[PDB]
Amino acid sequence: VSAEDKAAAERSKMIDKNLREDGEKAAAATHRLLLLGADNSGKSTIVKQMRSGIFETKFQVDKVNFHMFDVGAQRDERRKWIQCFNDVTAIIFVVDSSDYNRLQEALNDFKSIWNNRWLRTISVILFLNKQDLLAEKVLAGKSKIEDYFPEFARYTTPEDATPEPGEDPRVTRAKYFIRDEFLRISTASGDGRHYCYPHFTCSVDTENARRIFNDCRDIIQRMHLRQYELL
Amino acid sequence: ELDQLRQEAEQLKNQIRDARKACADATLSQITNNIDPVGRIQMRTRRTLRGHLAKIYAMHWGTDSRLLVSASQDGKLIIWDSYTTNKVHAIPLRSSWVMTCAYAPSGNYVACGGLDNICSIYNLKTREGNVRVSRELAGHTGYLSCCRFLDDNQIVTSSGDTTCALWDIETGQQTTTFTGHTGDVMSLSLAPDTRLFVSGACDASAKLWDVREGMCRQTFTGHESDINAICFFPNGNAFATGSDDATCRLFDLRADQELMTYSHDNIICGITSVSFSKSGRLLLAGYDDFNCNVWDALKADRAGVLAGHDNRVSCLGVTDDGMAVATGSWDSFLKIWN
Amino acid sequence: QVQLQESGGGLVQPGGSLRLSCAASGFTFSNYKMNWVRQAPGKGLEWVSDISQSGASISYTGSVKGRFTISRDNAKNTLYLQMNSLKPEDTAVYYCARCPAPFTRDCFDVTSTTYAYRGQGTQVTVS
Amino acid sequence: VRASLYSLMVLIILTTLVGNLIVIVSISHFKQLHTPTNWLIHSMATVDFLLGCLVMPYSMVRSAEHCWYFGEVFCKIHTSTDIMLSSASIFHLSFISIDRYYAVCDPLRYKAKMNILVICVMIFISWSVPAVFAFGMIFLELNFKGAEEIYYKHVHCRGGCSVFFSKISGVLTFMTSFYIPGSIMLCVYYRIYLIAKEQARLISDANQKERKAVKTLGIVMGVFLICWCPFFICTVMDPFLHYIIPPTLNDVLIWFGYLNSTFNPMVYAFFYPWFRKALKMM
Amino acid sequence: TASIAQARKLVEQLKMEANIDRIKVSKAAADLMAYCEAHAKEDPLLTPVPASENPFR
Ligand SMILES: CC(C)CCC[C@@H](C)[C@H]1CC[C@H]2[C@@H]3CC=C4C[C@@H](O)CC[C@]4(C)[C@H]3CC[C@]12C
Structure with missing residues (x-):
């Protein structure tokens, strides 16, 4: 009614208009990813191919933007600040497959992320890094994975496992055993709303961005199918 | 030498326990059994403040009890006018991971902070008319979980580095650092006289600090899990804490131990936010169970429920005149209750 | 106050048996998961075993699989680790660790450097 | 009993109107259903509501009583x-x-x-x-x-x-x-069927190491086809074949076509959890 | 000497917290209840206000 009230209402409408413009402008065909891992993993170098303590990484694949956030300025206690990443499309979990001693620690971290109340909807894009070093360690055989996982002795390679053409059967068995160790936790308590996408990535792999693109496409497609009662 | 110090600390703990037991003449529930219950406290959503496009992480009222600031995952620090739902301001944020926001008692400044370990002071009374970052406070080595304005010049911030800091805004330096918590300090609450403030950390303990001396006067234990919220009583001689064990507990500063506990068997979701009404009779707690429960602070009986939020209730504040209660939520909506 | 006092453990010959016991105070033992965390000299903390609220689900580190037996006594508020056939690689300080939140099957910061809900720990030496 | 038939067609008209009105009011009100997909569904609902309120009464009069009780110009309209x-x-x-x-x-x-x-x-x-x-x-x-x-x-x-x-x-x-x-x-929808079925098969595979798409797309396409296809087939046949079909066949096929607009809200809004729960909160 | 230094700091803090004076819990609860009774009439949440008085009508 009064001039001040009319000016306030017009300012509110202008603020709402600018706010709606910012929202779609920054959220359409862009996806946010939480980069998790340990010190030994190559988390900082997974998609670094064409890259305040939260290293933000931005990369593009097919006109779709991905904002990858790496939190690195906090203490080792993470049960609180990890709830800020509920709305990310995927969690990029990087594991050092060559380090068996800390591999159980990585498995426990993966289990905690999988079963968290605020992260049980987010699908994890597991990246089993350092595949070359894992292959070298298994081929050398000085360090035996059976010591850290006694049930590897009874393990056999899955039938549909697809090894590399020049890949040794022992290396195939070890890497697929580690992948199955992660997938057992993935499928034990998974509610079906989120999935784990394991990838045997290396230190020089240049297709991790495309892998993340395809996995996020699959995640969003499955979310759309679930929303439309098609899955 | 180490064993002697450990044994002396253990005997000091035993002496403190004995003194607290001696002071525990009666209980708040037993004393307040005579007074009548407040009855079914039912409120309704008087305003739904739409305009946030992502989860609302924090809010803070103004001293005028009309303007409130909210922070959200979208990266916007919107100052609202709850009376008319008009948006007075909308401040872009450098980092969208803000966990807290504070609105100065004078209303000239608004602060925010979060995973970027930085408390950013924004000037609202700028002569140019465009809000700008007046000062960025750095020095915290963990995420900044709460901040409260002492005045236009001083601010108190708690961080995930187990420390609370007192800042001088015009200089941008830590005037005083408060240490003693062994877990991520999750929230802080200023006393009415602003000479003391409590903090609730992830060690299931709450500590009362002296702002001027930088020393901790008391440590309050009893909670089972990480404390998520803390709020002084209007009297200034007590406070309430909400934790991950789905329990609210009220502590008395002079009695040096808790008075009453607010828990139920069916309540298995932790408290994200606590706040008191103007008289302190009602303790409002926001839970992860999408709802908020209005507790009877003197009888620990749930007097009402603030149902109406579609996601997790992250923040909860009561006006300085006690006229309304605002609850934000992860559903990107902030509601005014009365 | 959340307190977890560890008892038992000490000098033992290789191949021997030790039974660590942890006494809980200040919290409901049945609502939380319990872990066993050990810190070898010169090494960081390592998660040894696990047990759910009831005790039906038990998890172990592969090294201690078939040798250690985690036992929970909800009525007695005591957590046990029946260590059988000890070896010199097991010399470490053992901490009983309580998961941060009740009614949850995730345990984030159990192996943290300054986790609030561990105990003082008992030295276990094998020789 | 011709008056008794009326009851059936009036029930169809009221069902169409109430379903489309519910969809329209919910989408236009809730402030959380202003997605472009919900805008398409809202426009479809208003199309079906207008079709109901305008055509179905007069079409009922024509279908039940073999005579136009309205103006010849109104016939063209x-x-x-x-x-x-x-x-x-x-x-x-x-x-x-x-x-x-x-x-x-x-x-x-x-x-x-x-x-x-x-x-x-x-x-x-x-x-x-x-x-x-x-x-x-x-x-x-x-x-x-x-x-x-x-x-x-x-x-x-x-x-x-x-x-x-x-x-x-x-x-x-x-x-x-x-x-x-x-x-x-x-x-x-067939391509959607193929994609959803292969995705569900992939989920079943790894977990072992339902077919809700069948039900949903069958409901959609069966409602559409049963409600419209006989009508349009007979309509396109009549110009040829020297118009042998009885009028009552035309009047039941027209009402099948109207039944599609009746069933559109149920297929497209009430069928999905988000509309059901939002309508409940209302 | 980190462990002994932290133990010494804990000892000093515990002694400083122990030497303070604590009143009876009955007195504390009586004071809290008296404050709640005194400020009950000024609390809009406890006492419903007329629809004209509340600015959020
Ligand atoms: C013969 C024709 C032109 C009559 C008018 C048809 C159109 C314009 C009418 C018919 C039904 C109407 C809708 C009925 C109810 C609502 C819900 C209300 O909350 C907003 C308006 C809205 C969404 C109306 C918009 C206009 C509407 C779609």
Whole structure:
């Protein structure tokens, strides 16, 4: 009614208009990813191919933007600040497959992320890094994975496992055993709303961005199918 | 030498326990059994403040009890006018991971902070008319979980580095650092006289600090899990804490131990936010169970429920005149209750 | 106050048996998961075993699989680790660790450097 | 018992009106259902609501009583608006199918491609192209092109205000209103079926190491086909074959076509959890 | 000497917290209840206000 009230209402409408413009402008065909891992993993170098303590990484694949956030300025206690990443499309979990001693620690971290109340909807894009070093360690055989996982002795390679053409059967068995160790936790308590996408990535792999693109496409497609009662 | 110090600390703990037991003449529930219950406290959503496009992480009222600031995952620090739902301001944020926001008692400044370990002071009374970052406070080595304005010049911030800091805004330096918590300090609450403030950390303990001396006067234990919220009583001689064990507990500063506990068997979701009404009779707690429960602070009986939020209730504040209660939520909506 | 006092453990010959016991105070033992965390000299903390609220689900580190037996006594508020056939690689300080939140099957910061809900720990030496 | 029939058609009309009104009010009110997909569904609901309220009473009068109790000009108006609104409903079905095709097969670019501008263009096309086609053909052009004496003869022989379309007019209206949107709807849901089935098979595979798509797409496509296909088949057959079908067949097929608009809200809004829960919160 | 230094700091803090004076819990609860009774009439949440008085009507 009064001039001040009319000016306030017009300012509110202008603020709402600018706010709606910012929202779609920054959220359409862009996806946010939480980069998790340990010190030994190559988390900082997974998609670094064409890259305040939260290293933000931005990369593009097919006109779709991905904002990858790496939190690195906090203490080792993470049960609180990890709830800020509920709305990310995927969690990029990087594991050092060559380090068996800390591999159980990585498995426990993966289990905690999988079963968290605020992260049980987010699908994890597991990246089993350092595949070359894992292959070298298994081929050398000085360090035996059976010591850290006694049930590897009874393990056999899955039938549909697809090894590399020049890949040794022992290396195939070890890497697929580690992948199955992660997938057992993935499928034990998974509610079906989120999935784990394991990838045997290396230190020089240049297709991790495309892998993340395809996995996020699959995640969003499955979310759309679930929303439309098609899955 | 180490064993002697450990044994002396253990005997000091035993002496403190004995003194607290001696002071525990009666209980708040037993004393307040005579007074009548407040009855079914039912409120309704008087305003739904739409305009946030992502989860609302924090809010803070103004001293005028009309303007409130909210922070959200979208990266916007919107100052609202709850009376008319008009948006007075909308401040872009450098980092969208803000966990807290504070609105100065004078209303000239608004602060925010979060995973970027930085408390950013924004000037609202700028002569140019465009809000700008007046000062960025750095020095915290963990995420900044709460901040409260002492005045236009001083601010108190708690961080995930187990420390609370007192800042001088015009200089941008830590005037005083408060240490003693062994877990991520999750929230802080200023006393009415602003000479003391409590903090609730992830060690299931709450500590009362002296702002001027930088020393901790008391440590309050009893909670089972990480404390998520803390709020002084209007009297200034007590406070309430909400934790991950789905329990609210009220502590008395002079009695040096808790008075009453607010828990139920069916309540298995932790408290994200606590706040008191103007008289302190009602303790409002926001839970992860999408709802908020209005507790009877003197009888620990749930007097009402603030149902109406579609996601997790992250923040909860009561006006300085006690006229309304605002609850934000992860559903990107902030509601005014009365 | 959340307190977890560890008892038992000490000098033992290789191949021997030790039974660590942890006494809980200040919290409901049945609502939380319990872990066993050990810190070898010169090494960081390592998660040894696990047990759910009831005790039906038990998890172990592969090294201690078939040798250690985690036992929970909800009525007695005591957590046990029946260590059988000890070896010199097991010399470490053992901490009983309580998961941060009740009614949850995730345990984030159990192996943290300054986790609030561990105990003082008992030295276990094998020789 | 003819009066008893009325009860059935009135029940159909009221069901159509209430379902479409519920969809419209919920979408326009909730402030959380202003997604472009919900805008397409809202426009389809308003098409079906207008079709109900306007056409279905007078069409009921014509179907039940073999005589037009309204003006001869109102006959042209009613035929034009019936063709308009039926074609608009089928166009909206096709556009919703295309929107869900984009959501399923282009998940990362779905927000960009299916925006409010594109949805508004779709709504404008689905409202206007049927409008121009139907009204022009009925009024300015001639459905009975060729001055078919049978046009006049059939109109009197059959129920009042008969929808007579010449061979060319019949083929054109059939292809424009049913086949062109229907073929797109068939292919886009079949591809959606294939994708959803392969994804469900992949989930079943790894976990072992339901088919809700069948139920949902069967409901959608069966409702559409059973409600419309017999009507349009018989409609396109009548210009040929020398119009042997009885009038009662035309009047039951017309009411099947109206039954599609009756069942559209149930298929497209009430079927999904988000609308059910939001309507409950209301 | 980190462990002994932290133990010494803990000892000093515990002694400083122990030497303070604590009143009876009955007195504390009586004071809290008296404050709640005194300020009950000024609390809009406890006492419903007329629809004209509340600015959020
Ligand atoms: C013969 C024709 C022109 C009559 C009018 C048809 C159109 C314009 C009418 C019919 C039903 C109407 C809708 C009925 C109810 C609502 C819900 C309300 O909260 C907003 C308006 C809205 C969404 C109306 C918009 C206009 C509407 C779609």
